[PDB]
Amino acid sequence: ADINIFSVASGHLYERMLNIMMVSVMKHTKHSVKFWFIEQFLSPSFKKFLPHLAKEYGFSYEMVTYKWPHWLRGQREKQREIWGYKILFLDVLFPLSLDKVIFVDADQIVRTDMYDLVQLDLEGAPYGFTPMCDSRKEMEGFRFWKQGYWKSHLRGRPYHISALYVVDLNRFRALAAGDRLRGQYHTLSAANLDQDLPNNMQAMIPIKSLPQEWLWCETWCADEDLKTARTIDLCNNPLTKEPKLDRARRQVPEWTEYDNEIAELAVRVRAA
Ligand SMILES: O=c1ccn([C@@H]2O[C@H](COP(=O)(O)OP(=O)(O)O[C@H]3O[C@H](CO)[C@@H](O)[C@H](O)[C@H]3O)[C@@H](O)[C@H]2O)c(=O)[nH]1
Ligand SMILES: [Ca+2]
């Protein structure tokens, strides 16, 4: 397919949002799209509905059955296991026939043609991530990456949010980035695994910083930049603690539209 998107998450609300993420992608492209999931992290109900969603919205999909290898230290906590599946297996989840894959968070709403991200020049980097926004200045106290360990360690590189990333799998494989990430994981495994690990290894495994418009989250990013945002992440706000759905329905007018459309499809599938 032209566009290849990977997502992984757990839970009922995240499955509901995952369907909305997929629909949002299809509403903004005419290029072909394949979604890649990890079989064990989708509920039976989700897996039964998926072929119906695919036929309605004109995408293909694959459920991968890759299991955490015995030689790699596991994670007892589900959230951390899922973070491992996001970042530790990019060279092994996907076949060598695949040139590129994009991780999109299940809570995202896309407002752009994702083929633009496929075509974006990564300047030799094995992957590209969006920097955390500086624009909402009133949240500076929560920008942990601008002080202490991160300020000195980054030596002027951005700290990037892990909600969205494009992986040039040819470059990633050539650099043995998967081995390098797993190697650092083993050393460090003796906080936010999916985000801290790639941000920590930029000197060895570089990140191309995507233009800021690629990922807007209200927590970090100014109101004025919503109108130009290509994708929205519903990232949590440590100040307000505003609930996830309230953020979704408040921030994103089309969220309800997509949710309703999918629900109506489910009603018809069940009626038949
Ligand atoms: O019901 C849930 C709740 C969370 N998660 C996952 O748990 C992590 C934390 O997510 P969440 O509590 O919703 O916070 P967010 O603020 O949306 O997460 C932001 O920060 C995380 C790193 O801390 C990144 O993984 C996300 O991409 C980024 O959007 C993420 O991997 C989620 O996908 C689930 O799978 N199911
Ligand atoms: Ca998110």
Report the separation in Å between the CA atom of 161 and the middle of ligand 2, taken as the mean of its atom positions. 9
CB atoms within 10 A of CB 195: 21
The finding on whether 125 has its CB within 6 A of some atom of ligand 1 is no
Q: How was this structure determined?
A: X-ray
Asked if residue 123 lies in contact with residue 241, where contact means CB atoms within 8 angstroms, the answer is no
Ligand 1 atom closest to residue 10's alpha carbon, by position in its atom list = 35
- Amino acid residing at 209: S
CB atoms within 10 A of CB 263: 12
Give the DSSP letter string of 71-104: TS---SSHHHHHHHHHHS-TTTSS-TT--EEEEE
Query: Any idea which residue has 């109108």 for tokens?
Result: 227
Give the neighbor-by-neighbor strand order of the sheet with 207-209: 60-64, 33-38, 3-6, 100-104, 160-168, 127-131, 207-209
CA 164 to ligand 1 center in whole angstroms? 12
Long-range contacts of 233-242 (CB under 8 A, 24+ apart): 233/105, 233/107, 233/108, 233/161, 233/163, 233/164, 234/17, 234/107, 234/108, 234/109, 235/161, 235/163, 238/142, 239/139, 239/142
Helix, strand, or coil here: 165?
strand
Please state, in angstroms and rounded to a whole number, the distance separating the CA atoms of residues 140 and 123: 30
DSSP bridge partners of 209:
129
- Which helix (H) or strand (E) segment holds residue 168: the answer is strand 160-168
* 232 C-beta closer than 6 A to ligand 1: no
Atom of ligand 1 nearest to the CA of 83: 31
Degrees (nearest 5) of the Cα angle 42, 244, 196? 70
DSSP H helical ranges for 94-135: 115-119
Q: How far, in Å, from the CA of 107 to the mean position of ligand 2? A: 5
Structural domain containing residue 250: 1-272
CA distance 229 to 247: 16
Ligand 1 proximity of 105 Cβ (cutoff 6 Å): yes
Give the ligand whose atoms come closest to the C-alpha of residue 160. 1
Q: Give the span between the Cα atoms of 117 and 177, in whole angstroms.
A: 21
Backbone angles phi, psi at 122, to 5 degrees: -90, 0
Neighbouring residues of 154: CB distance < 8 A, sequence distance ≥ 6: 145, 199, 202
**Among 10, 13, 129, which is best to mutate for testing ligand 1, by the most ligand atoms less than 8 A from CB?**
10
Positive or negative torsion for Cα 123, 234, 146, 89: negative
Structure tokens at 50: 């998926």
- The three-state (H, E, C) secondary structure of 8-60, written as one string: CCCCHHHHHHHHHHHHHHHCCCCCCEEEEEEHHHCCHHHHHHHHHHHHHHCCE
Q: Which residue has the least CA distance to atom 19 on ligand 1?
A: 235
Contact 176, 189 (CB under 8 A): no
This structure's resolution (Å) is 1.4
| Domain tally, the chain | 1
Q: Could you tell me which of 253, 214, 239 has the C-alpha nearest to residue 120?
A: 214
Q: How many CA atoms lie within 13 A of 205 on its CB side?
A: 27
Our answer on whether the CB atom of 145 is closer than 6 Å to any ligand 1 atom is no
Q: Which of 207, 2, 210 is nearest to 98 (CA)?
A: 2
> What is the rounded distance in angstroms from the CA atom of residue 58 to the CA atom of residue 23?
10
Q: What's the Cα-to-Cα distance from 196 to each of 181, 193, 199, rounded to whole Å?
A: 11, 5, 5
Tokens at 10, concatenated: 């757990």
Q: Where are the alpha helices (DSSP H) in the chain?
A: 12-26, 44-57, 78-87, 115-119, 148-154, 169-174, 177-189, 193-200, 244-251, 253-271
